[PDB]
Design a binder for this molecule. Structure first.
Ligand SMILES: [Cl-]
Ligand SMILES: [Mg+2]
Ligand SMILES: [Mg+2]
Ligand SMILES: [Mg+2]
Lengths: 278, 277
């Protein structure tokens, strides 16, 4: 099965919702050539002990979500920004990888090295723990009865799983040092930040990765909760997910102005990057 | 307004739900008089810097939730257990205290000192960070526009707020060393543990503290999302919450056996303790 018959309409309705409810467009962080080579050098060094060879073009496609989905107005720490670039990219490679090749003894110390290079001592522990928790979660739930139960029961249980499994809690806990904004720092550490952005990130990511994931037999996708071959059922389910995104976006506007900018930029920027060609 | 007309029926239906879906009864951890005195002295020392004397009796009514809602058969570390007894009690008094007497500079070192007595170096930092985040969240959100939005929009937004605000995540992150169970430790550190148990704990807590909290102008209660004065609207809302608890409980049974016993003892033990003295 496939969502191809809805690809155009659903893209348009996503963009329309964002135009009406966030308005402010995402903007791409521009890395200098120096910064980008430093980032790729770190990514390559981190995945070397696993024997993987990743092309420059691969790294650049991975890093685009960070370039598009941070909040450049509010950036204060570019060392922290580069850390997110590197941690996002190497996690991507680890999640795109045959779990038989998952060597935690070789990979985990490379994650700690990245965090220790770019963050202060306190922030390095926070960022590293979320990274460790993410990759351990991913490993723990491949072919787990829990994943099947949470992903097939209801939209609520699936998104409850996805708070961690899509990596947004990880993302928040390594991204707050970029902004040094006290309120945002707390929302990141309570995971309220991740809970507020999970659905908008996951619904978008799920729609544009449905065809690929179901072809590989993966179940971590909310559109498996409806009959995508029944146009009527699909339209109702898609409107419900838009209704979730909107509700979340409206409550996000009750947060302080910087924090709200970061959340909405993350959701809206993730849609731009996902629907972009590179 | 009041949920008093529904107290007996809802209590019976809560109990019925647990007998049908959890079956296994919660059991009370009993502390030796030495163990309990150790807990209380620590509690007292932690809150003295704030000028607070607290009776043994009041400490014991606070600690009851820990004695009832942990999973006695799986306990392996009683030092960790006493830490939870203490951290729970002193955060109770910090929650029921005037936000003007909130001295973060005095209290946070006492929390750290508790975690350092009872936990290993690594577990101390985890328990301490969750305690810090809880009391800081509690301070951030009094009179916060965010709290107003999250508690009045939808049940989903409300329970999303309570994952932290009712302290489950804190509870999970200071309780996992009690059990030394690797799956539970991960489920607690990702907060999936708190996410699975938030609604079961919140709905029961909200029902039985509704009258007190609404009379105090507090809005952190799912039952203000419905008209409790309209029996038909209240019954419908209550059944919706019962359905939430049943779905979570049925999903919890997919976790490994030890983890799910901990999750279910927590939710069921909380109900028992809530409805007791
Ligand atoms: Cl930590
Ligand atoms: Mg995907
Ligand atoms: Mg409170
Ligand atoms: Mg209450």
């Amino acid at each position: 099965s496939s969502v191809r018959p809805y690809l155009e309409e659903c893209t348009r309705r996503f963009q329309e919702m964002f135009d009406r409810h966030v308005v402010t467009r995402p903007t791409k962080v521009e890395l200098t050539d120096a910064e980008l080579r430093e980032v790729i050098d770190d990514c390559n060094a981190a995945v070397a002990p696993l024997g993987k060879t990743v092309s420059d073009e691969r790294w650049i496609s991975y890093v685009g979500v960070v370039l598009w989905s941070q909040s450049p107005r509010h950036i204060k720490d570019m060392e922290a920004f580069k850390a997110v670039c590197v941690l996002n990219c190497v996690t991507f490679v680890w999640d795109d990888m045959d779990p038989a090749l998952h060597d935690f003894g070789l990979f985990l110390p490379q994650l700690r090295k990245i965090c220790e290079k770019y963050y202060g001592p306190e922030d390095a522990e926070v960022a590293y723990e979320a990274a460790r928790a993410f990759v351990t979660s991913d490993h723990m739930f491949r072919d787990s009865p829990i994943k099947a139960a949470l992903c097939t029961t209801s939209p609520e249980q699936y998104f409850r799983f996805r708070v961690t499994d899509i990596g947004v809690d990880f993302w928040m806990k390594m991204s707050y040092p970029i902004y040094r904004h006290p309120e945002f720092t707390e929302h990141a550490k309570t995971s309220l930040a991740a809970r507020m952005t999970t659905r908008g990130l996951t619904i978008v990511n799920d729609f544009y990765s449905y065809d690929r994931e179901v072809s590989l037999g993966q179940i971590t996708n909310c559109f498996r909760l409806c009959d995508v071959s029944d146009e009527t059922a699909f339209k109702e389910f898609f409107q419900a997910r838009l209704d979730d995104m909107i509700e979340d976006i409206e409550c996000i506007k009750a947060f302080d102005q910087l924090t709200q900018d970061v959340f909405l930029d993350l959701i809206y920027g993730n849609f731009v990057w996902t629907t972009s060609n590179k």
